[PDB]
């Protein structure tokens, strides 16, 4: 065939049940991740060739960057609670690895501010219950598919992306090859 196990996709062992339909996991400190998303645009890419009614979900991961990671695992769930994810990603992949201005806590929460989500709302949402089950979600899903490092994209609980068995001399043709891959296993 032209897609096969340990190409462009492995097959996880122990599947997931119930996992999102596709799951990418990341982080801010992670120099893969600032490239596969402010060089090779992979998420918004896959988005564009996800069938009809298929969705991605981002989670972020905290075995980078110690506690200011987590802290960006926290601010991730508050992202993800008041929708502002298109607002904040490139401000806090550039605070974090390009100018190396987000150093603390409180320069997060100033990213949100000059994104338009005022103080009080960003305090409300960070202290909130619904942010709380969203960071213990995000560490639930990389511990039930024994995830190890990031990037990481998995398709129905089953299927991990392999970007190592991609071509990698054409940057457009790599990101095609990675999002034609995610529909070919939405669908299988």
Not at 15 to 26: D, E, R, T, Y
Request: proline share 4%.
């Amino acid at each position: 065939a032209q897609y096969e196990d340990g190409k462009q996709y492995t097959t996880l062992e122990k599947p997931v049940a119930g996992a999102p339909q596709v799951l990418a996991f990341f982080s801010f400190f992670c120099p893969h991740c600032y490239q596969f998303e402010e060089v090779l645009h992979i998420s918004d890419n896959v988005k564009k060739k996800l069938p009809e009614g298929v969705k991605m979900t981002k989670y972020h991961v905290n075995f980078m960057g110690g506690d200011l990671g987590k802290d960006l695992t926290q601010a991730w769930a508050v992202a993800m609670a008041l929708g502002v994810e298109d607002k904040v990603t490139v401000p806090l992949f550039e605070g974090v690895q390009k100018t190396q201005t987000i150093r603390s806590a409180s320069d997060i929460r100033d990213v949100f501010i000059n994104a338009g989500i005022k103080g009080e709302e960003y305090d409300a949402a960070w202290n909130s219950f619904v942010v709380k089950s969203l960071v213990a979600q995000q560490e639930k899903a990389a511990a039930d598919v024994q995830l190890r490092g990031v990037p990481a994209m998995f398709v129905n609980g089953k299927y991990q992306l392999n970007p190592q068995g991609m071509d990698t001399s054409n940057m457009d043709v790599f990101v095609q090859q990675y999002a034609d891959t995610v529909k070919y296993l939405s669908e299988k």
